[PDB]
C-alpha cells in the first residue's frame, strides 16, 4: 500500500555528465551543473524520471503502455504515476591521488564527505521497512563510517596519508577494521571531513571553456564563449526507484529493469556526455 | 468660520528680510482687512517654526535682541552652507506694490463674494508670480535664516486649520493615510500597459479622495505631500478654471506661468490632456480642522469617527464612479470590439467589483483645548505636542503596519467556490475554476486558448461575434492568458488610459460630462515596450543614417510615414517621433523575430552600425531614512552609525549624537546669536543641572534691551529658562522638533526633487513607471544608467553642473532664476538597478527590484570614514544585477554625507571612477581584459592591511593591462579600506569595493550587446 | 522626586487596607478618559492568594496578574514583607501606553513569601460579577481616583472594559 | 499522538505568490510555502486510509470520517521546536524563547518595537539556517525531434532543507498510530516523498490566555468580513491576512474553496474566540467543526506549548 | 519527596562556592546527551546583580536569565536569602525536555534583595570568551556532572552550545 516496495541503484558516469540546471552565472560558470541543497552535484528527480522514460520508449515501444502507466502518461494527464525516482545523491566522486607511504600505489580514489553519507543513510533508513530489499549490511557500514564523524576515513588500510587532486594534503586513518568496500572496483573510498570535502570534490569537477568558431576563416565569433561544468567519468550517484504495488509495476520490475544496464542521461549528448551505467543493489554487496 | 486665511497666511510681508530691524510690517494688506488676531494668528505664528524656541518665545516677537543687517541664508538640514542675497530686493519703494496689484489681475476681476474660489486659486500661483520679480527666497528670521519664508507662510496658514477649529469649543485633527501595499500590486501586470496605470491607480484613487477636501476645506491642508509643485494639482486646478468658462487668453497668465516651471517640456497637462506621470506617494498626512460645511459656514460634530468611515467611502466613491463610467465607454463604443467583452463582464460581475483593488490605512489623532491653551493663551511648551501628535500618528502607522490585509481578502468568494456560481467566458473549468495569471491568486472569468485553432475556435465559445474584433482582443489580451475581474478592469484601462479623468478630476464635472470628451476623440497613445527601450540606439542610428541604409526597408513600416497622431507620455519619443521614422511599432517582429531578424542583420553589417542590444535597464530608487527625519530623528545624518532602534537608550550612544546636533544648531545662527546658544546647550550633565548654568550670557544680551523701549520688564529669569527647557528636550531626547514649517520645507523640496528627477531621466532616454518623489521606479536604456545615478544622487542631494529646463542647481540648494530653494543634502538615495533581457516575465522583475532593495536596506554594511577612524554605514548603496551577478556600490564614504562646500563633488564619485574606467576602455587606452585579470589581484589586496602597499597592486593591475604606456588613471586611495559586511544571506556579494567596481563594469558591458 | 505603588484587582475584596494614598502627586500613571482604562500594568510571574490577598512569585512566564501604580507607599506597616524597586520608567509592561514616562519611577509591590511547603499549581481565572468591580470602584477606584461620579458619563463603559481586560491567576490554595 | 514527517528530498507546496521576501535572480512561476497547509496533511493521511466505500461527493465530510482531529504544524530539528512568525510579507522560524518575551514586545512603544522585530526576523531567525529555496526549471521534449517542445517550460521554486528537519503534527486517534507509523508517502506537490513515523507523546492542551499564536491558518467565516476588518487590530496583533485556497479535492478534481484566513505565524488575541463563536450558524457550525478536525484553527499560547482550537 | 535547586550560569565570577549538597541523591533535572545542554531553565523578571552575583527580582518580563537544576540544597547557610519554592514541574518551562517530570519537586534559587539604590541599567549578555567556558566546565560542569569525562566526550559542543544559547540580563553595576 502506497510505495509498498522500492529498489535502490547506483548511477555510474561512463562518460562525463552534464545535467544542466538554471543556467545562471553565480559561480562564473555559464552552464553550471545541477546543485544540491549543500552545493554538491545532484540529479533532480525529473531528470531521472524523464530520461529513463525517454530511453525506454525509444527502446521498448511494445512496452509503451506499461512505461506510460508506471512512469507517467502524458497524452492523458489525468491518471497518477506509480513509479517515482528520488533525487540522485552524490555517493562518490573520483579524485586524483599521489601516494605517500603506501604499499599499493594508486592513481585515483573515490572521495565522499560525511554530509553526502548522511543523506544516503537518510534514504536507507526510510526504505528499510519495505522488507523486500533490506540489505542491512550496506547501511551498517554507513553506521560504522558515521561512527567516526570528524576524522578522515579510508577503507583500504595501506594509505595513511595522501595528496588529493594534487593540492590537498590529507591524513587518513583506516576504520581499525577490514570493512569490505561498497563500490565496484579495487579502488579506495576516502570519506573526508565535511570541510575539506567541499574543496577536493569542488576541485574534481571539470570546468571547460568552449567557443563557437566561424567555419569560414577559423576565428571565434563574437560572444561565443562560455564555461561548462561536467561531472567526471566513474562518478557514482545514488538514487532509489519507489514503486507502488500494481501488477503493471512488477512487470515493469520484471523484464524492463532487469534488461536495463546503460542509460543516456542529461544533456549535451552530441559531445558524448551522460552515458550512464546503472547498477542496482540486488546483485552486489 | 474660515477660507479667509490669506491674511492668516500673509500675516507678515513677503519682504521679511528687509523689514525686521534694519537693512532698508512694511506693507500689510490691500484686498482684505487687517490680519485676524486677538491672540489667534499670533500664536499661529509662534507654533509654526522651531526658531520660536531656538531663541526663546518673545525674542521671536521682540524682533531685536541680537539683530543683524548683514543677511545670509542657510539650508534647513545642514547649516554649514551659507547662501547670499545681498543688496538685491524686489524693486523700488513706489513700484513695491505693483506686485501686490499683480495679485489682482484675476482675483479682482472675479467677485470676492465666495471664498472657495479665491483661497485655492491664490495658493498655486503665489510663488510663481513673485519669483518672476526675483526676490531670492528670503528667510523668515534674520537672526536664524534656516527657514524659507513660504515654508513658514504656508505653515502659518496650514495650522490655521487648528486655530480656527479651536473656536467653537474644542476640536482639531491630524489624519494620515497610507495604502496597504504598493509594490506587490504594482508588480501585477503583463505588458507594461498594466504597470504604468497600476502606479496611476495608486495615485489617482488617492488623488480622488483629496479633491473631496480641497473643494471643501481649500488647499494648504495636506502637509505631506505639498500641493505647491504637484503635477496633479496643475491639471486639477487647470480644469477648475476651464469648468468656469473664462477665455483661453486669460488663462495664459496662469497656464504659461505654470508651463516653464512645472511641465517643462511641450507635452503638458494639456498636450496629451492628462498628467503624464503618477506622482502622489502612498503615504500622506492631513492636518484637519474639526469642521463640517453646510454652505459658507461650518459646524462641528464631536465624534472622532466622522472621518475614518466617511473618508474610506469616498475612496469607495471613486472606485464606483471609476468602473461605472468605464461601463459607459464599452457601452458607447460597444460595436467596436474588445469592448463587447469588457461590457459583457461588467454586466455579469457586479457583486465582486464594488470593492476596491487597493486599500488604505487611515489613522487619526486629534487635539483639544488642553496642552495648547492654559487660560486662553499659550502654556509652557505648547510646541511639544505637534511632533508628539506626529509621533502619535506614525505610531499608529507603526502599529498597524504589522498586519497587512491583502486587498484580495475583502471579497466574499466562499459560496462562489463551494457552489459553482462563477460566471465565466470561454472554456468551462474542468477544475472548478482557474487562477488569474496577472494577479496570481484570484479566479478567472476569462478563459482563453493559447492556440490549437486560435481565431476560429474562440468564436464558438462566446468571445467573438465576427473576425475583425478579435484583432483588438488579440491586441491587449495575449492568447492563453486568463484574467481576474480586477485585472480585466486594468487591461481595459490600459487601452484607454485617458478614461481615468473621471477619477482624476474627482468628478469635478458630472459623470457624463467627463467621459463624453473622449467618447469623441480617438487619439492613440503609446506605452513603450521592452524591445523599445532595449533598441533605443537602433532608433538613434536610424535617425543619423536616415534613409541611405533604408531602401530594402521602405516596405516594412520602419521608414514609412508616422501615421495617425500617435504621441506618448515619454519625452524622447515625443520630440523625435517626427524625424521620418515611425516609433509606434512593436519591434518583436522586425529585429526581434527570428525569421526576418537575420536578414535585418544582413542590412546592418553592410552599413556598419551597432546591433540592437537585447537588454534594457530597470532603475528603482528610495529615500533613505525619510520618515524619521520627518519625525526628527538623527539617523539620516549618521546612517548606519546609529540606526533608529538605538533610540531606546541614547544615554550610552551619547558620544557622537550630542556632537551632531550641537555643531549643527550653533552653525544655524548668524552673528551675536551664535554665542547665545553655545553655552546654554552644553550645561546638561556638565554643570549642577539647574538654572544659572547660562546666566553669564546675559551680559551681552543686555546690549539691545533698552534700545527703542517696548519691553514690559526688568527681570530675565524666564528667557534663560524656557530656552533651557527647549534644549532640555532636544538633548535628553535626540529627536529634533517637528514643526508645521518642518514638513512644508521638506515636502516642497520633495516636490522640487520630484520634477527635477522627471527632467533628469529624460535628459537621458528614460521612461517613468512610478515616481512618488521620495520613491521612484524608472526604466532607462542600458547605457545612460551610471551617469544618471551619478547625477541623480547629485540632484537629490542637490548639486549641478548642467542646466535643466529653467532651474539652476547649486550646492545644497536649487535656484530658479533668483530664488535659492533648499535641498535634501544629507538624505541618501538607495538604488536597485536590474539589467534585464526584454523577454523576462516582468511581474518578477518588479518583484526582485523591491525585494533586492529591502534586504539591501538591512544587511549591507561597509566601513566608512568617520573623523579619521573607520566606522560602519548601512544605507546609500546602488545595487546592480546583471542576472545573478550582483554588485553593491556605496555612495557616501563619509559620515555625515556633507560637512563643507568642498564635499559635494565627492557624493557618488565612486561611480565616476567606474565611469572614467569605462571612459578609457571603450577608446582602447585601458585594455578590455583588465576586468578578467583582476581576480588574480583580489586575493592580495584583500589580504593587504595598510594601503601604501596596496597602491602598487592597484597600479600594477592597471599598468599590466594597458595598451598605451603613458595613459594614467587616477584612483582614489580612500577606495581601498572599504569592506562589505553582508551576513546570513545566501546571495554572493564581494567583500571589497574594488571587486564591486570590477563587477559593476562586468554588468554594463554585459548589458551592451 | 516621585514614586508609586501597586494595587491589584482579584475576585476577592482584599484591597480595603492597602495604602494611605488617594492622589500623592497631582497626575497619575493610569488615566480616566471616557474610553476605558489607560496605562494599565501587567506583571507576569505573580499569582494571587485570594484569602488575605497577596501575590506569590512563581517561576512561570505566562502566570500573569494586572495591576495599577499610583503615587504612594503602603501604611508605614511594610518594608519587611513587600518588595520595591526603582526602574528606568520603561521596564514596565503596561497596556495602553498614553502619557510620556518620567525616565525614572519608584514603585512598591505587595509581595508574599514563596511559602515553600505547598505543591502550588495555580489556575487562571476571569473577572465576573459586574457588581464586584461596580463597587470595587466604591472600594478603591473612587478612593484612589475621586473622578468617579464626576467625569465619566458612561459608567458601564468602564465596567465592561474591566470585564474584558482584566483576568489573572490564583494560587487556588 | 505526535507524528513526525521526515522529507527525504526537497518539497513543493504550491503557493500562488502570496509572499516573496527573497531574491536569487529567480523569476519563478511557482513560489513555495514554507509550512504546508493542513489540507495537504489531512489529504495525505486520507490518501493512506482511503477506501472505495468511503467515496462520496463532499470531501471534508468524507475526510473527517477517515480520521480523528489533526493538530498544528511546526518543526523539530532534533533539538528545537521552531515556530512560524509573520510580520506581513515576511516569515521566520523561531523557537519559543523568542516568543515568551514577545507579548511583552507587542504593546510597547515606537522605538522599542523596531528594536525588537528587526533583531528577531533579521538576527534571531532560523529560516536561512534551515531553508534553501531551490529553483528548478523543467522542460518538455518531443520524442520525434529531440529538442525542446514548443511552449512547454516551467520554473518551479522548491523548498530544500539544509540540515535534517522534520514536521510536527498531533493526532488524537490511536488505532491508526500503527498503520501510519513508518509509511513512505507521496507528501507534497510535484511527486515528492516524505516519511511518517508515530511516537506517543504527552502534550498539554487548552489554556485560556489573551495572546495566542496560530500554528495553522485560522479560517474566517466569510460573512462578517466587514465586522472583522473594521477593527482588524482587535483580533490579530501581528501577522498577515489573505484569501487562501483550501486546495484540491482528489475524487472530483477541482479546487476546493477559497476563504480569507489569518495566516499561520500570526499573533492573535483572545477576542477572536468569541468572535467566531458568535458569528457562526448551523450550516457553517457543522462545516467548521470539520475544519478544526483537520486542523485549521490551531492556537498555541506563548507561555508553553499548549494547543487549543477555536470551537475547542 | 524531592527537592531541586537552581544554578544560574553567567560569565560572572561569583560562583566560587555556594553548593555543598551537589549530588545528594542521584537524579538532577538538567542533563547533557551528546547534543548540547538539556533542560536549561529560563526565568523571567530576574536579572544578575553582579556585585557578589545573585538574582534581583525586577518587574519586566523582557528580563530573563538561564540556568540549570541540580539535586539538593546549597550549603545550608541561607534560605534567609534564597527564594526556596516548590512547583509541580509545570510552571517552570525549560528547553530540551526529555522525560516526564515527577509532577512535583522543590526549587532553590539564589535571590537578591530589591534594594533600589539606582535604576537597574539592564543589559543583555551572551556567553563569550572560550576561556571562561574552560574554567567554568572545571568549576561546575564537572563537580555536578561527574558523568562528564566518563560518558560525555564531545566537550567542544557543550562549549559550542552555551556561547550562543545561554544568555542573561544585568544591571551594569
Ligand atoms: Zn487577476
UniProtKB/TrEMBL annotation, chain A:
GO BP term, pick one: defense response to virus
UniProt keyword Signal, yes or no: no
Keyword Flavoprotein in record: no
Entry keywords, A to Z: Antiviral defense
Pfam family, any one: RAMPs
InterPro entries: CRISPR-assoc_RAMP_Cmr4, RAMP_III_fam
Domain (CRISPR type III-associated protein): residue spans on this chain: 11-277
Name the record gives this protein: CRISPR-associated RAMP protein, Cmr4 family
Native source species: Saccharolobus islandicus (strain REY15A)
UniProtKB/TrEMBL annotation, chain B:
Disulfide links within the chain: 484-487, 550-559, 683-693
Spans through the membrane: 195-214
Annotated Zn(2+) 1 binding sites: 436, 439, 484, 487
Ranges of residues in domain CRISPR-associated protein Cmr2 N-terminal: 174-323
Binding positions for Zn(2+) 2 per the UniProt entry: 436, 484
Residue span(s) of domain Cas10/Cmr2 second palm: 737-857
Keyword annotations: Antiviral defense, Membrane, Metal-binding, Nucleotide-binding, Transmembrane, Transmembrane helix, Zinc
UniProt name for this protein: CRISPR-associated protein, Cmr2 family
Annotated source species: Saccharolobus islandicus (strain REY15A)
TrEMBL record, chains C, E:
GO biological process, one term: CRISPR-cas system
Pfam families for this protein: Cmr7A
Domain of life from the UniProt record: Archaea
This protein's name: CRISPR-associated protein Cmrx
Source organism (scientific name): Saccharolobus islandicus (strain REY15A) (Sulfolobus islandicus)
Organism classification: Archaea, Thermoproteota, Thermoprotei, Sulfolobales, Sulfolobaceae
From TrEMBL, chain D:
InterPro entries referenced in this protein's UniProt entry, alphabetically: CRISPR-assoc_protein_Cmr3 (IPR019117), CRISPR-Cmr3_IIIB (IPR010165), CRISPR_assoc_ribonuclease (IPR052875)
Highest taxon of source: Archaea
Pfam families, per the entry: Cas_Cmr3
Gene3D superfamilies: 3.30.70.2940
Name this protein carries in UniProt: CRISPR-associated protein, Cmr3 family
Organism: Saccharolobus islandicus (strain REY15A)
Amino acid at each position: 500500500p502506497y510505495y509498498a516496495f522500492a529498489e535502490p541503484f547506483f548511477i555510474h558516469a561512463i562518460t562525463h555528465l552534464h545535467v544542466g540546471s538554471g543556467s545562471s552565472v553565480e559561480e562564473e560558470i555559464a552552464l553550471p551543473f545541477q546543485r544540491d541543497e549543500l552545493g554538491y552535484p545532484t540529479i533532480y528527480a525529473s531528470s531521472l524520471k524523464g530520461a529513463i522514460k525517454s530511453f525506454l520508449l525509444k527502446e521498448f515501444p511494445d512496452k509503451r503502455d506499461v512505461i506510460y502507466k508506471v512512469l507517467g502518461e502524458d497524452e492523458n494527464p489525468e491518471e497518477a504515476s506509480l513509479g517515482t525516482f528520488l533525487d540522485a545523491i552524490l555517493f562518490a566522486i573520483p579524485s586524483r591521488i599521489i601516494e605517500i607511504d603506501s604499499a599499493k600505489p594508486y592513481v585515483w580514489v573515490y572521495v565522499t564527505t560525511y554530509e553526502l553519507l548522511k543523506k544516503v543513510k537518510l534514504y536507507l533508513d526510510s526504505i528499510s521497512q519495505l522488507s523486500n530489499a533490506s540489505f542491512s549490511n550496506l547501511k551498517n557500514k554507513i553506521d560504522t563510517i558515521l561512527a567516526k564523524e570528524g576524522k578522515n576515513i579510508t577503507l583500504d588500510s595501506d594509505l595513511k596519508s595522501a595528496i588529493l587532486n594534487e593540492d590537498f594534503y590529507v591524513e587518513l586513518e583506516a576504520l581499525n577494521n577490514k570493512i569490505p568496500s561498497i563500490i565496484n572496483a579495487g579502488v579506495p573510498l576516502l570519506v573526508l571531513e565535511d570541510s575539506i570535502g567541499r574543496e577536493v570534490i569542488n576541485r574534481s569537477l571539470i570546468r571547460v571553456r568552449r567557443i563557437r568558431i566561424d567555419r569560414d576563416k577559423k576565428v571565434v565569433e563574437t560572444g561565443g564563449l562560455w564555461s561548462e561544468e561536467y561531472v567526471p567519468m566513474k562518478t557514482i550517484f545514488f538514487s532509489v526507484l519507489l514503486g507502488k504495488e500494481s501488477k503493471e509495476s512488477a512487470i515493469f520490475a520484471s523484464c524492463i529493469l532487469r534488461n536495463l544496464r546503460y542509460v543516456i542521461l542529461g544533456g549535451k549528448e552530441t559531445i558524448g556526455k551522460g552515458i550512464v551505467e546503472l547498477r542496482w543493489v540486488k546483485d552486489v554487496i | 468660520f474660515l477660507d479667509y486665511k490669506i491674511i492668516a497666511l500673509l500675516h507678515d510681508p513677503p519682504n521679511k528680510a528687509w523689514v525686521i530691524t534694519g537693512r532698508a510690517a512694511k506693507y500689510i494688506i490691500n484686498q482684505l482687512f487687517g490680519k485676524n488676531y486677538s491672540e489667534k494668528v499670533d500664536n499661529a505664528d509662534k507654533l509654526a517654526s522651531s526658531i520660536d524656541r531656538y531663541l526663546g518665545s518673545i525674542v521671536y516677537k521682540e524682533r531685536s535682541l541680537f539683530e543683524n543687517r548683514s543677511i545670509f541664508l542657510k539650508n534647513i538640514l545642514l547649516s554649514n552652507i551659507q547662501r547670499d542675497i545681498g543688496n538685491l530686493f524686489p524693486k523700488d519703494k513706489s513700484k513695491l506694490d505693483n506686485l501686490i496689484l499683480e495679485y489682482k489681475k484675476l482675483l479682482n476681476v472675479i467677485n470676492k463674494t465666495n471664498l472657495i474660489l479665491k483661497y485655492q486659486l491664490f495658493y498655486l500661483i503665489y510663488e510663481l508670480v513673485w519669483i518672476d520679480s526675483k526676490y531670492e527666497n528670503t528667510p523668515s528670521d534674520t537672526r536664524n535664516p534656516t527657514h524659507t519664508i513660504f515654508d513658514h507662510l504656508y505653515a502659518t496658514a496650514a495650522m490655521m486649520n487648528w486655530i480656527l477649529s479651536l473656536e467653537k469649543e474644542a476640536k482639531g485633527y491630524l489624519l494620515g493615510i497610507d495604502t496597504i501595499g504598493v509594490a506587490d500590486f504594482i508588480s501585477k501586470g503583463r505588458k507594461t500597459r498594466d504597470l504604468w496605470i497600476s502606479s496611476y491607480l495608486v495615485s489617482a484613487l488617492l488623488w480622488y479622495v483629496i479633491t473631496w477636501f480641497i473643494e471643501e476645506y481649500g488647499p494648504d491642508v495636506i502637509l505631506f505631500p505639498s500641493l505647491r509643485f504637484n503635477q496633479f494639482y496643475a491639471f486639477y486646478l487647470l480644469e477648475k478654471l476651464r469648468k468656469e468658462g473664462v477665455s483661453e487668453d486669460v488663462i495664459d497668465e496662469i497656464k504659461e506661468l505654470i508651463t516653464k516651471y512645472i511641465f517643462n517640456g511641450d507635452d503638458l497637462f494639456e498636450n496629451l490632456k492628462i498628467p503624464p506621470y503618477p506622482i502622489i506617494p502612498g503615504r500622506i498626512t492631513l492636518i484637519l480642522p474639526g469642521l463640517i460645511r453646510e454652505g459658507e459656514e461650518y459646524k462641528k460634530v464631536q465624534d472622532d469617527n466622522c472621518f475614518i468611515s466617511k473618508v474610506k467611502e469616498r475612496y469607495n466613491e471613486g472606485w464606483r464612479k471609476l468602473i461605472e463610467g468605464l461601463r459607459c465607454y464599452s457601452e458607447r463604443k460597444r460595436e467596436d470590439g474588445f469592448w463587447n467583452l469588457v461590457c459583457r463582464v461588467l454586466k455579469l460581475t457586479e457583486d465582486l467589483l464594488q470593492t476596491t483593488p487597493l486599500n488604505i490605512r487611515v489613522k487619526q489623532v486629534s487635539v483639544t483645548e488642553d496642552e495648547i491653551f492654559n487660560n486662553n493663551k499659550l502654556r509652557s511648551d505648547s510646541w511639544k505636542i505637534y511632533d508628539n501628535k506626529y509621533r502619535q500618528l506614525v505610531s499608529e502607522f507603526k502599529k498597524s503596519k504589522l498586519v497587512k490585509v491583502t486587498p484580495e481578502s475583502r471579497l466574499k468568494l466562499f459560496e462562489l467556490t463551494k457552489f459553482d456560481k462563477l460566471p465565466q467566458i470561454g472554456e468551462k473549468s474542468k477544475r472548478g475554476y482557474e487562477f488569474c495569471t496577472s494577479c496570481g491568486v484570484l479566479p478567472a472569468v476569462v478563459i482563453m486558448p493559447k492556440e490549437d485553432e486560435l481565431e476560429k475556435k474562440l468564436i464558438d465559445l462566446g468571445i467573438a461575434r465576427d473576425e475583425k474584433d478579435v484583432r483588438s482582443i488579440k491586441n491587449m489580451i495575449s492568447p492563453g492568458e486568463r484574467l481576474c475581474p480586477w485585472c480585466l478592469v486594468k487591461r481595459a484601462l490600459g487601452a484607454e488610459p485617458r478614461l481615468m479623468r473621471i477619477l482624476l478630476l474627482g468628478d469635478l464635472y458630472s459623470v457624463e460630462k467627463i467621459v463624453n470628451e473622449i467618447v469623441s476623440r480617438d487619439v492613440k497613445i503609446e506605452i513603450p515596450s521592452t524591445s523599445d527601450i532595449a533598441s533605443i540606439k537602433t532608433f538613434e542610428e536610424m535617425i543619423e543614417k536616415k534613409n541611405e541604409i533604408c531602401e530594402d526597408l521602405k516596405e516594412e513600416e520602419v521608414c514609412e510615414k508616422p501615421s495617425e497622431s500617435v504621441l506618448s507620455m515619454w519625452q524622447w519619443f515625443n520630440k523625435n517621433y517626427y524625424n521620418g521614422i515611425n516609433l509606434t511599432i512593436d519591434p518583436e517582429e522586425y529585429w526581434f523575430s527570428e525569421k526576418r531578424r537575420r536578414y535585418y542583420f544582413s542590412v546592418f553589417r553592410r552599413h556598419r552600425i551597432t546591433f540592437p542590444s537585447p537588454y534594457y535597464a530597470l532603475v528603482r530608487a528610495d529615500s533613505d531614512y525619510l520618515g524619521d527625519l520627518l519625525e526628527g530623528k538623527l539617523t539620516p545624518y549618521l546612517a548606519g552609525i546609529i540606526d533608529s532602534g538605538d533610540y531606546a537608550n541614547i544615554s550610552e550612544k551619547k558620544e557622537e549624537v550630542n556632537k551632531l546636533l550641537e555643531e549643527y544648531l550653533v552653525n544655524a545662527g548668524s552673528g551675536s546669536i551664535v554665542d547665545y546658544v553655545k553655552t546654554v546647550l552644553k550645561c546638561i550633565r556638565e554643570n549642577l543641572n539647574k538654572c544659572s548654568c547660562a546666566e553669564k550670557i546675559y551680559s551681552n544680551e543686555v546690549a539691545k534691551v533698552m534700545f527703542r523701549v517696548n519691553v514690559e520688564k526688568a527681570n530675565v529669569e524666564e528667557e534663560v529658562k524656557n530656552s533651557l527647557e527647549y534644549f532640555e528636550t532636544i538633548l535628553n531626547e535626540g529627536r529634533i522638533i517637528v514643526t508645521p514649517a518642518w514638513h512644508v520645507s521638506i515636502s516642497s523640496a520633495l516636490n522640487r526633487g520630484l520634477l527635477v528627477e522627471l527632467e533628469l531621466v529624460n535628459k537621458h532616454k528614460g521612461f517613468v513607471i512610478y515616481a512618488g518623489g521620495d520613491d521612484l521606479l524608472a526604466m532607462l536604456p542600458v547605457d545612460e544608467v551610471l551617469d544618471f545615478i551619478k547625477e541623480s544622487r547629485r540632484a537629490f542631494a542637490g548639486f549641478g553642473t548642467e542646466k535643466l529646463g529653467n532651474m539652476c542647481l547649486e550646492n545644497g540648494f536649487v535656484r530658479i532664476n533668483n530664488a535659492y530653494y533648499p535641498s535634501l543634502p544629507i538624505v541618501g538615495r538607495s538604488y536597485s538597478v536590474i539589467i534585464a533581457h526584454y523577454a523576462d516575465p516582468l511581474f518578477f522583475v518588479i518583484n526582485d527590484s523591491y525585494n533586492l532593495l529591502e534586504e539591501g536596506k538591512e544587511i549591507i554594511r561597509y566601513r566608512v570614514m568617520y573623523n579619521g577612524e573607520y566606522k560602519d554605514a548601512k544605507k546609500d548603496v546602488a545595487i546592480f544585477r546583471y542576472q545573478g551577478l550582483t554588485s553593491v556600490i556605496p555612495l557616501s564614504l563619509k559620515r555625515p554625507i556633507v560637512s563643507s562646500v568642498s564635499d559635494f563633488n565627492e557624493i557618488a564619485s565612486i561611480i565616476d571612477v567606474i565611469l572614467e574606467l569605462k571612459k578609457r576602455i571603450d577608446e582602447g587606452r585601458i585594455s578590455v581584459s583588465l576586468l578578467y585579470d583582476y581576480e588574480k589581484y583580489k586575493h592580495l589586496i584583500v589580504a593587504s592591511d595598510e594601503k601604501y602597499l596596496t597602491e602598487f597592486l592597484v597600479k600594477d593591475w592597471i599598468k599590466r593591462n594597458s595598451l598605451r604606456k603613458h595613459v594614467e588613471f587616477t584612483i582614489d586611495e580612500k577606495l581601498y579600506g572599504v569592506r562589505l559586511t553582508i551576513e546570513n544571506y545566501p546571495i554572493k556579494i564581494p567583500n571589497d569595493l574594488i571587486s564591486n567596481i570590477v563587477y559593476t563594469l562586468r554588468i554594463i558591458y554585459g548589458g551592451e550587446k | 522626586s516621585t514614586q508609586r505603588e501597586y494595587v491589584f484587582i482579584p475576585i476577592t475584596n482584599s484591597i480595603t487596607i492597602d495604602v494611605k494614598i488617594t492622589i500623592g502627586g497631582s497626575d497619575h500613571i493610569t488615566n480616566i478618559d471616557e474610553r476605558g482604562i489607560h496605562n494599565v500594568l501587567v506583571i507576569t510571574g505573580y499569582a494571587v492568594d485570594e484569602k488575605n490577598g497577596r501575590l506569590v512569585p512563581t517561576l512561570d512566564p505566562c502566570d500573569y496578574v494586572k495591576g495599577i501604580l499610583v503615587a504612594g507607599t503602603p501604611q508605614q506597616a511594610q518594608s519587611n514583607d513587600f518588595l520595591t524597586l526603582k526602574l528606568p520608567a520603561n521596564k514596565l509592561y503596561l497596556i495602553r501606553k498614553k502619557g510620556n514616562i518620567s525616565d525614572d519611577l519608584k514603585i512598591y509591590i505587595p509581595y508574599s513569601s514563596p511559602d515553600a511547603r505547598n505543591s502550588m499549581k495555580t489556575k487562571p481565572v476571569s473577572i465576573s460579577d459586574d457588581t464586584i468591580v461596580n463597587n470595587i470602584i466604591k472600594e478603591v477606584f473612587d478612593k484612589i481616583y475621586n473622578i468617579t461620579q464626576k467625569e465619566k458619563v458612561k459608567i458601564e463603559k468602564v465596567k465592561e472594559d474591566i470585564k474584558e481586560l482584566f483576568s489573572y491567576y490564583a494560587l487556588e490554595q | 499522538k505526535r507524528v513526525l514527517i521526515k522529507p527525504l528530498e526537497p518539497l513543493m507546496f504550491r503557493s500562488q505568490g502570496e509572499f516573496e521576501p527573497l531574491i536569487t535572480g529567480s523569476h519563478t512561476a511557482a513560489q513555495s510555502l514554507i509550512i504546508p497547509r493542513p489540507s495537504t496533511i489531512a489529504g495525505m493521511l486520507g490518501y493512506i486510509l482511503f477506501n472505495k466505500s468511503s467515496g462520496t461527493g463532499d470531501w471534508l465530510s468524507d475526510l473527517t470520517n477517515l480520521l480523528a482531529t489533526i493538530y498544528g504544524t511546526f518543526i523539530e530539528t532534533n533539538g528545537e521546536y521552531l515556530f512560524p512568525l509573520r510580520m506581513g510579507n515576511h516569515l521566520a522560524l523561531v523557537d519559543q524563547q523568542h516568543l515568551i518575551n514577545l507579548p511583552t514586545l507587542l504593546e510597547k512603544e515606537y522605538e522599542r518595537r523596531e528594536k525588537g522585530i528587526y533583531e528577531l526576523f533579521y538576527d534571531k531567525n532560523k529560516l536561512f539556517q534551515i531553508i534553501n529555496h531551490q529553483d528548478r526549471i523543467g522542460i518538455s521534449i518531443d520524442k520525434s525531434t529531440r529538442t525542446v517542445k514548443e511552449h512547454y517550460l516551467y520554473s518551479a521554486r522548491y523548498l530544500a532543507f539544509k540540515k535534517e528537519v522534520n514536521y510536527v503534527i498531533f493526532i488524537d486517534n490511536d488505532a491508526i498510530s500503527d498503520k501510519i507509523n513508518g509509511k513512505i508517502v507521496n507528501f507534497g506537490g510535484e511527486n515528492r516523498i516524505a516519511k511518517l513515523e508515530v511516537d506517543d507523546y504527552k502534550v498539554d492542551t487548552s489554556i485560556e490566555e489573551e495572546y495566542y499564536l496560530a500554528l495553522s491558518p485560522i479560517l474566517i467565516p466569510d460573512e462578517a468580513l466587514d465586522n472583522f476588518l473594521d477593527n482588524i487590530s482587535d483580533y490579530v496583533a501581528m501577522g498577515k491576512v489573505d484569501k487562501i485556497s483550501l486546495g484540491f479535492d482528489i475524487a472530483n478534481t477541482k479546487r476546493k474553496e477559497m476563504l480569507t484566513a489569518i495566516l499561520e505565524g500570526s499573533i492573535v488575541k483572545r477576542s477572536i474566540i468569541d468572535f467566531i463563536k458568535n458569528e457562526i450558524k448551523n450550516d457553517l457550525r457543522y462545516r467548521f467543526s470539520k475544519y478544526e478536525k483537520i486542523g485549521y484553527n490551531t492556537l498555541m499560547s506563548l507561555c508553553k506549548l499548549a494547543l487549543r482550537k477555536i470551537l475547542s
